[PDB]
A and B are shown apart, each in its own frame.
Chain A
Amino acid sequence: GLPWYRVHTVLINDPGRLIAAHLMHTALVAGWAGSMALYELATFDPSDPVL
C-alpha cells in the first residue's frame, strides 16, 4: 500500500477533493487565529500600555 509519507498523493488527480483538503486547511488556520486571539484576550492586561 502507500507508505505513510505519501498518503496525501491520492489528491493529485482529484481536484474536488483537493479543494476539500485546501478548504479544511483554511478552516483550521482561521480557527487557530480565532482561538489564539480569544486566549490572548483572556490573558491580556490592558491597564498599562506604558510599562
Chain B
Amino acid sequence: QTLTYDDIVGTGLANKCPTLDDTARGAYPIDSSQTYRIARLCLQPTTFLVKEEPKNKRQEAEFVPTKLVTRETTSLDQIQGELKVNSDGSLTFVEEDGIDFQPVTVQMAGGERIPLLFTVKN
C-alpha cells in the first residue's frame, strides 16, 4: 500500500527493499528500438559470509557465517542507471548514482570484527 514515513519510522522497515506478490511471474518485453532505465534498485543483504584463514598446512578455506553488529543500516537503495540493449540482444545496466555503499561490521567466532564497504559503485 501507500505507507507514510510515520508508519515506518523506527520499525526496521526502512532497511527493507520492496517485494512482489507470489503471483508476479510475468515478463517485461524489451523493445530493442527503445531506451530503458532502472529507476530504483534496492539491495538488502540477508547474510554475510567471510572466508576463514586456512592455517599454513591449509587444505581448503571455508566461508563462515558471521554476526552483524551495526544494525539495520545495510541496504543499498535509490540506485539508478540506464538499461542499454546491446546488439547481441543482451541487457546491460550501468549504475549512475544512488545510495550504493553501506559500511558494515560483522563479527566472526572468536570475536574478530570484520568491517567492509558493502557496495556496487560503478
Chain B min CB distance to A38 (Å): 15
Of A13-21, A22-30, A43-51, the one with at least 4 CB within 8 A of chain B: A43-51
Contact check, B55 vs A51: say whether CB atoms are below 8 A apart.
yes
* 0 or 1 for each of B94-120: is its CB under 8 Å from A? (1 = yes): 000000000000000010000000000
Which residues from B are CB-within-8-Å of A51?
Answer: 55, 57
Residue of A nearest to B59 (CB): A50
CB distance from A35 to the nearest CB of B (A): 21
**Minimum distance in angstroms from B21 CB to a CB of chain A:** 46
**B residues less than 8 Å from A50 (CB atoms):** 57
**A51 to B56 Cα, complex, angstroms:** 10
Whole-angstrom CA separation of A50 from B55 in the bound complex: 10
Q: Residues on A close to B: CB < 8 A?
A: 46-48, 50-51
- Please name 7 pairs of A and B residues whose Cβ atoms are closer than 8 Å in the assembled complex, sorted by A: A46-B110, A47-B55, A47-B110, A48-B55, A50-B57, A51-B55, A51-B57
